[PDB]
Amino acid sequence: SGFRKMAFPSGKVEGCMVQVTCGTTTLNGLWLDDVVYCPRHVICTSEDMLNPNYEDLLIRKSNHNFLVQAGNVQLRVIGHSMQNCVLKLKVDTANPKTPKYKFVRIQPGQTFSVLACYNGSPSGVYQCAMRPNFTIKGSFLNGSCGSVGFNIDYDCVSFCYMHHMELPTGVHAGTDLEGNFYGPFVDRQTAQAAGTDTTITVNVLAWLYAAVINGDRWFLNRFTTTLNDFNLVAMKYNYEPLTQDHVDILGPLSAQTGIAVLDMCASLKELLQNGMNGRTILGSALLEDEFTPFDVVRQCSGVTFQ
Amino acid sequence: SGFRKMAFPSGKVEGCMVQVTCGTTTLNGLWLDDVVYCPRHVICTSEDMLNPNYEDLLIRKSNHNFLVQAGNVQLRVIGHSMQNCVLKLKVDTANPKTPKYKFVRIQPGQTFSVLACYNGSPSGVYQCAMRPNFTIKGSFLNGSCGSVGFNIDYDCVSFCYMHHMELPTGVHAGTDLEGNFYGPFVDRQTAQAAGTDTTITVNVLAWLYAAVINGDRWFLNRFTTTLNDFNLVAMKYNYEPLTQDHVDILGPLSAQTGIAVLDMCASLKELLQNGMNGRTILGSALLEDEFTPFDVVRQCSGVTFQ
Ligand SMILES: *[C@H](O)[C@H](C[C@@H]1CCNC1=O)NC(=O)[C@H](CC1CCCCC1)NC(=O)[C@@H](NC(=O)OC(C)C)[C@@H](C)OC(C)(C)C
Numbered sequence: 001s002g003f004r005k006m007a008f009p010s011g012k013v014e015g016c017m018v019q020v021t022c023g024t025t026t027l028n029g030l031w032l033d034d035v036v037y038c039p040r041h042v043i044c045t046s047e048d049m050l051n052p053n054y055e056d057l058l059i060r061k062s063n064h065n066f067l068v069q070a071g072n073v074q075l076r077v078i079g080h081s082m083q084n085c086v087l088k089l090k091v092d093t094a095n096p097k098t099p100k101y102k103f104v105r106i107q108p109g110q111t112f113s114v115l116a117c118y119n120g121s122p123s124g125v126y127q128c129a130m131r132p133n134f135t136i137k138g139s140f141l142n143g144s145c146g147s148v149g150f151n152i153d154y155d156c157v158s159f160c161y162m163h164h165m166e167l168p169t170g171v172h173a174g175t176d177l178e179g180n181f182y183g184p185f186v187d188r189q190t191a192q193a194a195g196t197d198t199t200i201t202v203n204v205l206a207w208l209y210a211a212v213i214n215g216d217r218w219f220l221n222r223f224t225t226t227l228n229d230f231n232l233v234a235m236k237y238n239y240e241p242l243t244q245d246h247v248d249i250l251g252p253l254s255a256q257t258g259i260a261v262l263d264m265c266a267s268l269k270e271l272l273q274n275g276m277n278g279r280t281i282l283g284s285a286l287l288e289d290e291f292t293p294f295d296v297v298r299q300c301s302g303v304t305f306q
Numbered sequence: 307s308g309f310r311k312m313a314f315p316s317g318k319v320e321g322c323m324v325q326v327t328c329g330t331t332t333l334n335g336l337w338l339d340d341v342v343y344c345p346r347h348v349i350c351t352s353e354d355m356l357n358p359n360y361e362d363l364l365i366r367k368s369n370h371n372f373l374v375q376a377g378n379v380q381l382r383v384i385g386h387s388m389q390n391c392v393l394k395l396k397v398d399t400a401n402p403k404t405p406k407y408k409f410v411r412i413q414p415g416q417t418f419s420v421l422a423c424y425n426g427s428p429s430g431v432y433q434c435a436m437r438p439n440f441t442i443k444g445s446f447l448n449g450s451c452g453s454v455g456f457n458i459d460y461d462c463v464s465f466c467y468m469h470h471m472e473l474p475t476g477v478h479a480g481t482d483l484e485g486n487f488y489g490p491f492v493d494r495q496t497a498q499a500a501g502t503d504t505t506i507t508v509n510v511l512a513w514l515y516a517a518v519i520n521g522d523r524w525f526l527n528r529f530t531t532t533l534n535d536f537n538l539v540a541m542k543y544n545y546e547p548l549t550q551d552h553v554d555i556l557g558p559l560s561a562q563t564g565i566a567v568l569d570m571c572a573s574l575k576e577l578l579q580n581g582m583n584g585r586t587i588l589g590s591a592l593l594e595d596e597f598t599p600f601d602v603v604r605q606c607s608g609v610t611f612q
């Protein structure tokens with residue numbers, strides 16, 4: 001038993017990370033087959049950053065301007081191309097450690113593991129969610145650009161995130177692996193702000209089920225509630241609406257515990273109305289929203305990868 | 307910026323995990339060079355578990371009783387030997403993925419990353435601490451025995467923990483990689499209990515410094531306190547004594563923030579006396595004790611491995 005913020009094992013991604021250096025800028029690249037993916041602002045500098053124009057900037061670069069290093073072995077760039085906000089550097093060597101992989105653009109509320117990297121060397125691994133405002137509450141220092149977010153599904157790495165920037169509020173923004181930003185952010189140095197965030201209600205519900213699977217029952221009640229009446233209370237506390245699709249997704253968790261989803265909603269309602277009154281749930285004194293229903297099933301039941 | 311429970315990248319350990327099967331029992335082994343390490347109760351069964359006697363049990367086994375599988379390639383056991391509570395199975399093949407490594411027995415309060423495994427396949431990675439009562443608050447299901455805990459120091463994997471058992475309270479107990487249990491636990495099925503736990507005070511202090519490094523300052527005060535007077539308040543709230551050695555270890559964190567350690571102690575004192583009053587620190591509504599002073603420096607400054 002027990003419940004932990006669990007990231008996926010990171011070995012299949014460690015084997016893909018490289019350092020990319022152009023001009024005065026060093027960041028992280030993702031080496032898959034014979035292509036290295038990285039954020040396109042690597043072709044910027046300190047005065048290119050104001051209001052860039054990357055097409056003009058990229059036509060001025062030669063292949064030998066990109067220094068790409070995999071270990072103490074640095075690769076030869078034989079071509080480049082821009083796709084939205086990512087560079088794709090063609091190198092003369094295929095990565096022999098290329099896992100089976102996909103590129104996926106995830107929905108808000110979905111979770112993924114982040115392998116934080118500096119100078120092409122992995123630093124640490126942790127679990128994050130795409131917030132409803134399309135930021136992520138990461139842990140990123142200078143030079144972490146190019147670190148990726150990913151899920152693992154049997155032996156396939158689904159890459160879902162590349163890191164670009166930190167916002168004044170301390171949260172983080174980036175792109176899918178095809179260069180499209182999550183959210184309304186753009187890769188300029190102009191005032192941008194996150195936009196109001198909300199709590200991922202389906203995830204809270206999923207974590208209460210995790211609590212019940214692990215032996216916490218103190219917050220349950222006899223009451224129930226309708227979906228409209230739950231949503232009327234969730235709105236007041238800045239929670240997202242729960243859709244019938246969310247209810248369905250929470251089916252297995254309901255069926256395994258014997259607590260109807262609408263009954264767990266009545267529990268959350270009273271939890272939001274009265275606070276936790278100095279108790280904890282799964283070691284937390286706040287209602288936790290960065291576990292998906294899939295996360296709970298995986299950890300409380302024990303799915304692996306090979 | 308930002309602050310996260312960060313585990314070490316797990317690739318160098320994923321490459322060592324194997325499945326070990328003997329009789330009706332399947333658990334996880336650690337393959338380093340030509341030896342596979344695993345918990346010795348793999349030679350038990352459902353009636354061997356009552357009050358075992360592993361010397362007698364082990365002299366009755368032949369090498370071909372141990373089925374050891376690394377991928378869809380299973381190894382040949384050519385010898386075995388017991389060392390405290392771990393089996394060391396000699397195999398005819400050296401693991402080509404053996405990292406540079408050490409075996410270290412850690413102190414309470416120290417943290418490490420756990421690679422949870424089933425049937426030799428890594429499942430997920432997370433960060434834990436050795437509690438003052440020598441248990442760990444892990445996340446472990448049946449078949450997770452043999453999963454290891456580790457730190458990484460440049461390119462050297464310091465293995466510090468092998469998983470053996472869960473206790474009635476839901477916490478977890480195991481050994482160092484030489485088979486010595488942490489704590490007073492033994493590998494029998496007899497009533498054992500954890501013993502009262504305490505909060506790791508130096509770690510709390512270290513995490514408040516993490517908070518200040520990241521922009522939280524609301525909990526600081528002008529007051530200060532002596533070490534005796536801090537320890538008199540910590541005792542009342544079930545915190546461990548803070549030694550001068552702890553103060554020294556918190557030197558760099560003090561020097562980087564301009565907050566004397568004894569001043570941060572006065573902050574914690576008021577935090578313990580008045581609660582947090584509905585505020586959070588680094589996203590937590592409880593004082594967090596599973597970050598060491600080294601953990602904070604690593605994450606807030608950005609040390610890697612290669
Ligand atoms: C790349 O490694 C780096 C990662 C950040 C540094 C600190 N934490 C990070 O996550 N990204 C940047 O430094 C980035 C540079 C590019 C320049 C051209 C395209 C935009 C990003 N700059 C930032 O993240 C800055 N944020 C920013 O300008 O956001 C505006 C307001 C929308 C950071 C470094 O500045 C602070 C002051 C921290 C907000």
Ligand SMILES: *[C@H](O)[C@H](C[C@@H]1CCNC1=O)NC(=O)[C@H](CC1CCCCC1)NC(=O)[C@@H](NC(=O)OC(C)C)[C@@H](C)OC(C)(C)C
Pocket residue numbers: 001333347350355446447448449450451452470471472473474478492493494495496497498
């Ligand atoms: C090995 O994979 C497994 C891991 C635990 C199963 C569930 N969670 C775990 O971490 N370890 C065991 O199942 C272990 C078997 C051996 C048998 C001989 C030596 C002792 C351990 N048994 C337990 O962990 C049980 N705990 C236990 O007997 O502790 C006593 C009270 C000291 C667990 C499975 O039983 C419960 C009811 C969960 C406490």
